[PDB]
Symmetry: C5
């Protein structure tokens, strides 16, 4: 009934072993206290008892000089990534460029590379969708926008905000580690595991410098991702403003047409009032006259036209 961790252990030779271990047993094996493996923070990287404990959203990892541990890897679609890349990356000719460096360098490089790839994939999924939605929405020949595309844009904007928050947290953690040389020195766990051995093992190679360079590379990649996401958000805001202006302009055009038609209808009704008054079933002295009917019809139509033209001219003067 005790809580357990689903642990995937990658050895220094790339061998992978998956099992389940009691939390107390894991603490005893790793020489860590219970508070060290709480993983309470959304993303964090810490060095406790010469062990690199890190969490990035759903990825919880513990790096020791002997091996790497992935915790709570189930129901996250991580099996493909783990069993297809990590044996190759840690113990092969993969994209990792820190192979001659100790195991922790390869481990942290692989973890940061996977996380940066996940963020870049999220951005590369979001960008075309947002771009095409904005292009459809800011189309100047549409009187009104599509509301389903508006909802899609809202969902994509929420996803982009979440991605920006994730990238900002990544950058903040990496920069906080890079700022202090003490954290960089602590990150070299293999160096501090046997300081006497590494006093002569390091033949002029600085582990702290290599860690600083790797973290700087990943921080620069995260900064590029953040810049791209910020540009996307700015473009979204500009497109929203353009949509507002387009809708207002269409409303103004429709209102102008409606006002002109209202002027025409008002003139027609104004002279139809005279027509109806002459059409009442009341006795008058103009029934005997013959040209009176045609004269009234002609003056009604001509006056309606003239009043409509005068009202249009007045509208043009008012709108300058």
């Amino acid at each position: 009934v005790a809580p357990v961790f689903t642990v995937t252990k990658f050895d220094k030779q790339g061998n992978v072993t998956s099992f389940e271990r009691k939390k107390t047993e894991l603490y005893q094996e790793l020489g860590l206290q219970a508070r060290d493996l709480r993983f309470q923070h959304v993303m964090s990287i810490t060095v406790r008892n010469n062990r690199i404990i890190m969490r990035m959203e759903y990825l919880k990892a513990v790096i020791t000089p002997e091996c790497l541990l992935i915790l709570d890897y189930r129901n996250l679609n991580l099996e493909q990534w783990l069993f297809r890349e990590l044996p190759s990356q840690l113990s092969g000719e993969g994209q990792l460029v820190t192979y001659p460096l100790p195991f922790e360098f390869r481990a942290i490089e692989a973890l940061l590379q996977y996380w940066i790839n996940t963020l870049q994939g999220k951005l590369s999924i979001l960008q075309p969708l947002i771009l095409e939605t904005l292009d459809a929405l800011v189309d100047p020949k549409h009187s009104s926008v599509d509301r389903s595309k508006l909802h899609i844009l809202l969902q994509n904007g929420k996803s982009l905000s979440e991605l920006e928050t994730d990238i900002k947290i990544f950058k903040e953690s990496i920069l906080e580690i890079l700022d202090e040389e003490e954290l960089l020195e602590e990150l070299c766990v293999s160096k501090w595991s046997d300081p006497q051995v590494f006093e002569k093992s390091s033949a002029g190679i600085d582990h702290a410098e290599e860690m600083e360079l790797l973290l700087e590379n990943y921080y620069r990649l995260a900064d590029d991702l953040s810049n791209a996401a910020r540009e996307l958000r700015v473009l979204i805001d500009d497109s929203q403003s353009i949509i507002f202006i387009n809708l207002d302009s269409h409303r103004n055009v429709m209102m102008r047409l409606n006002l002109q038609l209202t002027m025409g209808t008002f003139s027609l009704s104004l002279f139809g009032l005279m027509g109806v008054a002459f059409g009442m079933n009341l006795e008058s002295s103009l029934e005997e006259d013959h040209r009176i009917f045609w004269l009234i019809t002609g003056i009604m139509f001509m006056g309606s036209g003239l009043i409509w033209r005068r009202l249009l001219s007045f509208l043009g003067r008012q709108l300058e």
Copy 2:
């Protein structure tokens, strides 16, 4: 008539005693001046005369190596929290992970844990309400939004702004304490109470390091809370923009329909003017003709239809 403090004292063994003490008596017992216990700031943490005086909104606490004091705990619903958790947390197997550390560590951990739990509970109450209100409001099939839900959203946004201010103050205080090592050293009140004893009592354990780790943990939790609240505010702003665009699009659609109907009415009235003119009670030469009535009716209807179609085509050309 002198002002008094309602003091709840938790001993190192977890015993709880509630009473009322004169302010001067409290100053004499704690070895503190009057200005130290003013609690004038909304949130503050200070170390005065080897005592940790802190306030977080309605929670005022004084931590000494011997015991903990809660001041002005009445009419705040704090009795349940106090008498149900603190005896267990300070002197039991609770969630506190600093039990082997001196009493002040457990005290500050419990206080910070309670405050972070209160903030997290406020956020977890606000988030579903705001989410459901926005989902109802940004529904694309609604011609107009619900104004009662708008008022609810406004109240929830005010509450969220207050929560963000509280989280920001928490983060600022914790970060200000963490920045200077002097404050961290001062926080270890038991260490400085008897420096001669603790010169040998601390068998290789660094109290300052433990305090730094605890404060870093709580600062990271507060940072996560602040990130979540900022994401909620950004989502609120995006939903407001989407609501604006939806309302404008609905207005444009309704205006287009009204303009088309106005065109139809204008054409109908234009030919009804001819109908009325022919319907006047004035003598003419066309009463004798038989087909004239049907011809006039037919040309009126056909011309009304043709003018309506031409006006619709003109509107389509104007709106592109």
Copy 3:
């Protein structure tokens, strides 16, 4: 004709004396150059020739170990504050908590307390007015807002922006003083007036520490005021957005009702066109028939109703 200062001098014993002194005479008495008393900055605090020269908007003060000087105190409603509080605060049992400390501590504490009280009073005047104006404006049952209340809100927002600027300047000055220990040491003017005497006069009491604590207290109070003002501005912006959404929703509802009525009027006019055509004074073959009139009337009314219903259904389909 030479410029003069209206000087109110408060002695160390609380005695108050008001007079007018030539600027050159004041410079000679205070041992300060002309540039020191320019008071060109809206708010500043400086230590020149062992004298604390400060200005906060309309309050210009010079603090020396012997006494305090208030300059240009006329036509500012400051007489009540001066002659009712300062004799009591500097030489009595007032709210000042630095009485055993040298005179400059009491002086600067009284000045900062008065300024923070003025800012807090401005905020406590602005807050209820803004709150009630927003509550009236964001009322969901109002079709349109009250424009006089809008102007009142604009004036209150301008006042709140000015208050925020004042609080920000206060915080910036206090934080700039607190950042450098040299400024804090300079602030202890009585300590540096006779360093030989104060080498033994200070029996274990640190004047710099007391000054730092006092400035920290006032900075925290100013930070609380700034947080409250920022919350007020954020609430104002949110209320403005809610007002915009409410007005747009009311416009949409009115437009929908107008469109439905336009559909009804259009159908009525469409069948009134047939009515008028049958009502023309032209010969036809349907006058002999008896049921034709009732048939035409019935079909006109029924078709008007049916076309209105069909148009309403079309509008419902269009608006989804």
Copy 4:
């Protein structure tokens, strides 16, 4: 054909001499390289080869212990300022407060004073215009705003943004100089011209301290100007929001009136349909009856009134 500088030289005694000098000759005389006098930056202050080279927009100056040089002073309306103030300020009883200090102090004080006066004059020109334009625009009794005043406000806002950029650059340059003591020491060009002489010439007076105080004074003045400009921009934004709300409220009121009139017209047309149907030239059985005409007229008018009242009540219910 070689490029030349129009140089105005002010001697230590205030004598002014205007001439034109070849760029190479100026470099040889001042002991400076070509890159030093490029003046490529909008505003900069630098110390090269014991010479203070500064540019502030159109004002290019080179300060040496012997004299001051103004370059490219033509076609800028600077002749009045130069020949009316600088001889008086550098060698008289002007507003300069650094007369006993070496010549470079007076020179830099005069230059910074002129630039701060120019910025303050720009702000004092912009502020009344913007204030009166906003007051005219936010008038609650105007149905629509004046568009010419809108264009004036746009131009003034662009000018205010340019002024804010200039003030920000001024503040940034002054603060960057003040941050590093090395730059402040370099600014004392007369001190470093003959260090052996000034080792004993400076009888207890610190040139670096005086330079720091002068730069702090001008930085505080620039900060006050920036605060005023930021307040003006915030007021402009608030006035724009108030204008938006006023226009929306006026639109809503007009729409409500139009909707009520549309209800009235719809009821009138609904009963005029019955009137027209009874007015058709078709045989019926109601011509014989005498009271039928008055009954129809009365029911038409009464029903029109009742339907209008019912529609108004329905609108009131809908708008709550």
Copy 5:
């Protein structure tokens, strides 16, 4: 099949040679590892193994004391710039002002000058287009804006945002290099190539100081560019707000005219209802009277006019 670099090598004497080299061969020749030439960052400047590796968007360069290398220069329109300026700039009398300095100074100066010229050209292309588009759009005499110009403005705003991001990255990289003296010292690659030779070769000239001055110059140029771009964005936002206000004012004016015409039409229809009622084909007692027809017509017209005037007065009262 191995990846290759298209390398353009500029010798210290200005000779240019273009070829293609295997990546491994380039690493061997430059003494650099594979990770050094990844060019994964949008812009970066680094010093690896005494070589300055930099990338600025599409421009990838490697600076060694012997020569300069441009990588991946094809299909970028860079041939003109390379073969027309760089031989002249590096080995001639060009705009470079660091000719007596070692080769790396000239190389980095030329690269930074080209990049700053590219950014300035982009800004100088964007600014007139944006200015003219805004001037056309904010024209107060236009009832509605041009939507094609709106799309052009949106595209130009996206381009301006990209330019701002590029300038910000440039400034960040230059400032990060300038902040640390270690990076500035590393940048002097020729100095560290043969430290023994340059211990006496540098006859009182500080390479680090020259590098700092050059980087400061380019940072100031980039800051000016960023200020101009920010001013352009602020002007764009202000113009958008002015366009919104203009469209709202035009809508309000059109709505007022439509409401007045609706009042007129409503009065005309109200009295036409009486006209139609009197015009019904129903028997009455007023056919015998002679003046009744003219009386009805006169009262209808007069009442229509009076009701229209009263409605206009009511509208004026409502709108204040």
